[PDB]
Design an enzyme around this catalytic site. Structure first.
Site, PDB file in Angstrom:
ATOM      1  N   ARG A 175     -95.878 -73.406  26.067  1.00 59.59           N
ATOM      2  CA  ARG A 175     -97.002 -73.448  27.024  1.00 59.59           C
ATOM      3  C   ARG A 175     -97.880 -74.670  26.790  1.00 59.59           C
ATOM      4  NH1 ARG A 175    -100.540 -71.186  23.103  1.00 59.59           N
ATOM      5  NH2 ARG A 175     -98.971 -69.752  22.206  1.00 59.59           N
ATOM      6  N   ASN A 176     -97.797 -75.220  25.585  1.00 58.44           N
ATOM      7  CA  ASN A 176     -98.573 -76.381  25.200  1.00 58.44           C
ATOM      8  C   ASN A 176     -97.821 -77.712  25.239  1.00 58.44           C
ATOM      9  OD1 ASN A 176    -100.868 -74.823  24.948  1.00 58.44           O
ATOM     10  ND2 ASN A 176    -100.543 -74.422  22.741  1.00 58.44           N
ATOM     11  N   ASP A 178    -101.008 -74.934  17.148  1.00 58.04           N
ATOM     12  CA  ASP A 178    -100.766 -74.176  18.374  1.00 58.04           C
ATOM     13  C   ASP A 178     -99.584 -74.737  19.206  1.00 58.04           C
ATOM     14  OD1 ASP A 178    -101.066 -72.079  20.223  1.00 58.04           O
ATOM     15  OD2 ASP A 178    -102.801 -72.927  21.215  1.00 58.04           O
ATOM     16  N   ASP A 198    -103.031 -79.440  24.210  1.00 57.33           N
ATOM     17  CA  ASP A 198    -103.835 -78.383  23.612  1.00 57.33           C
ATOM     18  C   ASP A 198    -104.142 -78.576  22.144  1.00 57.33           C
ATOM     19  OD1 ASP A 198    -104.816 -75.553  22.811  1.00 57.33           O
ATOM     20  OD2 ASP A 198    -104.475 -75.331  24.973  1.00 57.33           O
TER      21      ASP A 198
END
Length: 307
Positions: free
Chosen positions: A146-147, A142, A160
């Site tokens: 955003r992570n 992932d 994450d």
């Protein structure tokens, strides 16, 4: 396969920390912001406190505990630091506070003040963090802008681990079974066969770089998830960002090659981006680095008596 994971899972007492102020919610539960104050020591540690919603859902607690497992097993400057868990009604994850939030919103909110040195240095750091995950045989699954969290504008860390999977010794690829992975950041081999490798993480690295390079754009803003697979088989890829020289864009492109072994290794991305970080303006072209109009403006102090 072999090598006992002797990592220490730390259990913190609810009274050792003050929740101070809320930071977000999202979809998992509620992420607070606070201070951790260990009983004996005389120190205050800024902290992020994540948890689950009031109603306890078993497989949701399994998932939090699975995350704590992977987070307690990593130790690198560019990977999120787990402090411990608090076994309250719902198991709370206690991590290091990253004041500037996630990198995606950081670039979006700071476009006009982000120069080439920062962009390239973030690419190095993220590559370092990922190379470390590879050394520990861990596939993120992932990775995306955003992570990646921001401790300071000059220091970022990957986060994450809610989908991360540890690979065995006689294993080389993880075979998923569910179906809730973000398609716009995944390799073709992952969409078509649910396969995942460190090399699959590289594809996501490529997309993450593109996000940073375009100051937070959404990949394939038009095309709907269900169609992405097709555009990729045809040969279509993300476009060359305006600030990118062909040198930088060629790196992204290589991360997006159908052949997994053809893509670059995180250890190579560290080297390539490090070389570029030594002379930023040669690789990223950025304008920066009150009545908006043109360039014939001169201050009165420099305009001396004409006629």
């Amino acid at each position: 396969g072999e090598a006992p994971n002797q990592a220490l899972l730390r259990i913190l007492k609810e009274t050792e920390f003050k929740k101070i102020k809320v930071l977000g919610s999202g979809a998992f539960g509620t992420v607070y912001k606070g201070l951790w104050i260990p009983e004996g020591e005389k120190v205050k540690i800024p902290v992020a406190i994540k948890e689950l919603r009031e109603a306890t859902s078993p497989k949701a607690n399994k998932e939090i505990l699975d995350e704590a497992y992977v987070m307690a097993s990593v130790d690198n400057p560019h990977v999120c630091r787990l402090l411990g868990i608090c076994l309250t009604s719902t198991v709370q994850l206690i991590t290091q506070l990253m004041p500037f939030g996630c990198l995606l919103d950081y670039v979006r909110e700071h476009k006009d003040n982000i120069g080439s040195q920062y962009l390239l240095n973030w690419c190095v750091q993220i590559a370092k963090g990922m190379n470390y995950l590879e050394d520990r045989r861990l596939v993120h699954r992932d990775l995306a802008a955003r992570n990646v969290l921001v401790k300071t504008p000059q220091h970022v860390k990957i986060t994450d681990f809610g989908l991360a999977k540890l690979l065995g010794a006689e294993e080389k690829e993880y075979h998923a079974e569910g179906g809730k992975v973000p398609i716009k950041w995944m390799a073709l081999e992952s969409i078509l066969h649910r396969i995942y490798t460190h090399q699959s993480d590289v594809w996501s690295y490529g997309v993450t770089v593109w996000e940073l390079m375009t100051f937070g754009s959404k990949p394939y803003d038009g095309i709907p998830a269900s169609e992405i697979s097709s555009i990729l088989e045809k040969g279509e890829r993300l476009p060359q960002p305006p600030i990118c020289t062909i040198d930088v864009y060629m790196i992204m492109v290589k991360c997006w090659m159908i052949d997994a072994d053809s893509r670059p290794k995180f250890r190579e991305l560290i080297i390539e981006f490090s070389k570029m970080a030594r002379d930023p303006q040669r690789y990223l072209v950025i304008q920066g680095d009150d009545e908006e109009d043109m360039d014939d403006v001169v201050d009165a102090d420099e305009y001396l008596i004409p006629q």
